Design a protein around this ligand. Structure first.
Ligand SMILES: CC(C)=CCC/C(C)=C/CC/C(C)=C/COP(=O)(O)OP(=O)(O)O
Ligand SMILES: [Mg+2]
Ligand SMILES: [Mg+2]
Ligand SMILES: [Mg+2]
Length: 536
């Protein structure tokens, strides 16, 4: 008796990532020049007597070039002084850039800086329609607004229509920059993805470009990439020596895509241990999801759920043979995590990710019960269960394990479901439900998010999808507020949550599943970050 037929596609990568040997003489040549270039760039930033506009473009450029992680103190000192001087007598270009940079760094600059660009209605003067650089910087700023910033309600609609109108007659590479911004704003994009584009497609082709910065950025990207390929190789060998590819054939083989996810949360060198731990957890929870979703009967899913709650190797024999495989690999993974952290006396913190995982599994089992019964809950009740099945409470907790500065007090903050984490989870939930509604409705999912929304409020599929779209917009306003100073925990521990929200937006862009169907969205990203170097 049982089970379903297989419909998931295999790893489109094969074994091309399994073996990477660093050219050690090259790695050392790149690092040699980067040291030199890094200090020239420090002295650019610490130059006395620059104009406001010149300082902001410098800082903007270093950030989009992806080398700003080298200068976090310098950039901060400078923005703090800009914030505290209240300078605005400027143009739309400089004002909007000033607003965006300060807010992204948590400085609660007043949105009244924009009042001089508006009439008596809080609607932007149409005489600004001929100023393309002003419109571009306004467009990017409009994505960083909060609930206190309703003066900016018109800014996205206003800049968009006039950038669309101007774009075809613009010189290059400006035209390519405007066209790309309309597809993907800076604030909600994945940082490595935006950096690759900017270095190669834009800055490399500017006539105004600074040669020192460009070469710095190219060498730095390509050097980090060698690190990332080493990480991916070692994770690929771990996945292979597990061999779920042949013994648990019902599950997707997506370890490379899971690594891309992890790289989106943080790309810097100091988080290499954190990235390796995170990707192992993503790929394992993905197998557990396919067990609930694509193979296991209601009886054995109940046994799997209770074994996860009790968390004890003694429990394996109460499970079907095929569940013994994954269950043992899960218990083993956390015993590994404990050993790796034993060297800095941080083993005790592992228990936090584990409790979050038990929670994910309970809700997988509820979601299954709803399916068998054909139950369509209220939107209220649907959310109470379906928020945790995004796994985002659990990946956020897991992202802290490998960060050497995460303290127990940091995990306690996160355990209370703070507002910035709840918003990141809400974005994942509603975007995934909008993108995959038809996919599931076709194969009997009565308990799908949009369908609860339709039955509850008594509305069409169009109106349901627009209410979800709107929940996502509210959630971004709450993320943006959550970054403002004074912060509840250090900023280092907020950025991973923000980056989780960015991954959703990039993966589900234009509205179909990019994780299940990687060749859609992710394949070109993975090639640009992890296969092709930037050509010097
Ligand atoms: C939610 C999400 C996009 C997570 C991305 C990162 C991650 C943990 C992937 C694991 C596998 C997963 C949740 C696939 C979605 O399919 P599904 O339809 O079984 O997921 P669902 O039950 O959350 O809709
Ligand atoms: Mg599922
Ligand atoms: Mg699934
Ligand atoms: Mg789904």
């Amino acid at each position: 008796i049982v089970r379903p037929v297989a419909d998931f596609s295999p790893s489109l990568w094969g074994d091309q990532f399994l073996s990477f040997s660093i050219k050690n003489q090259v790695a050392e040549k790149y690092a040699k020049e980067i040291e030199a270039l890094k200090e020239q760039t420090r002295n650019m930033l610490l130059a006395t007597g620059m104009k406001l506009a010149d300082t902001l473009n410098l800082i903007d450029t270093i950030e989009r070039l992806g080398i700003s992680y080298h200068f976090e103190k310098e950039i901060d000192d400078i923005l703090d002084q800009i914030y505290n001087q209240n300078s605005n007598c400027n143009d739309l270009c400089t004002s909007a850039l000033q607003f965006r940079l300060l807010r992204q760094h948590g400085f609660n600059i007043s949105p009244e800086i924009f009042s001089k660009f508006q009439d008596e209605n809080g609607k932007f003067k149409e005489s600004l329609a001929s100023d393309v650089l002003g419109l571009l910087n306004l467009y990017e700023a409009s994505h960083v607004r909060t609930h206190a910033d309703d003066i900016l309600e018109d800014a996205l609609a206003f800049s968009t229509i006039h950038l669309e109108s101007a774009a075809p007659h613009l010189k290059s590479p400006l035209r390519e920059q405007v066209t790309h911004a309309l597809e993907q704003c800076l604030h909600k994009g994945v940082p490595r993805v935006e950096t690759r584009f900017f270095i190669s497609s834009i800055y490399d082709k500017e006539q105004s470009k600074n040669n020192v910065l460009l070469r710095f950025a190219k060498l730095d990207f390509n050097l980090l990439q060698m690190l990332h390929k080493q990480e991916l190789a070692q994770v690929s060998r771990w996945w292979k020596d597990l061999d779920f590819v042949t013994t648990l054939p019902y599950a997707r083989d997506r370890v490379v895509e899971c690594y891309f996810w992890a790289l989106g949360v943080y790309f810097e060198p100091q988080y290499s241990q954190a990235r390796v731990m995170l990707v192992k957890t993503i790929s394992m929870i993905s197998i557990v999801d396919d067990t609930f979703d694509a193979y296991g009967t209601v009886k054995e899913l109940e046994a799997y759920t209770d074994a996860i709650q009790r968390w004890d190797i003694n429990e394996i024999d109460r499970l079907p043979d095929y569940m013994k495989i994954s269950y043992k690999a899960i218990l083993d993974l956390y015993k590994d995590y404990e050993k790796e952290l034993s060297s800095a006396g941080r083993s005790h913190i592992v228990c936090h990710a584990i409790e979050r995982m038990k929670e994910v599994v309970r809700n997988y089992n509820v979601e299954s019960t709803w399916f068998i019964e054909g139950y369509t809950p209220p939107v209220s009740e649907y959310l109470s269960n379906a928020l945790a099945t995004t796994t985002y409470y659990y990946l956020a907790t897991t992202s802290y394990l490998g960060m050497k500065s995460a303290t127990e007090q940091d995990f306690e903050w996160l355990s209370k479901n703070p507002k910035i984490l709840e918003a990141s989870v809400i974005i994942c939930r509603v975007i995934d439900d909008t993108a995959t509604y038809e996919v599931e409705k076709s194969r009997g999912q009565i308990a799908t998010g949009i369908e609860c929304c339709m039955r509850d409020y008594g509305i069409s599929t169009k109106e349901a999808m627009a209410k979800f779209q709107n929940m996502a917009e509210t959630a971004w306003k709450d993320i943006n507020e959550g970054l403002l100073r004074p912060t509840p925990v250090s900023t280092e521990f907020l950025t991973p949550i923000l980056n989780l929200a960015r991954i959703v937006e990039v993966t589900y862009i234009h509205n179909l599943d990019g994780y299940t169907h990687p060749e859609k969205v992710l394949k070109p990203h993975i090639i640009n970050l992890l296969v092709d170097s930037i050509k010097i």
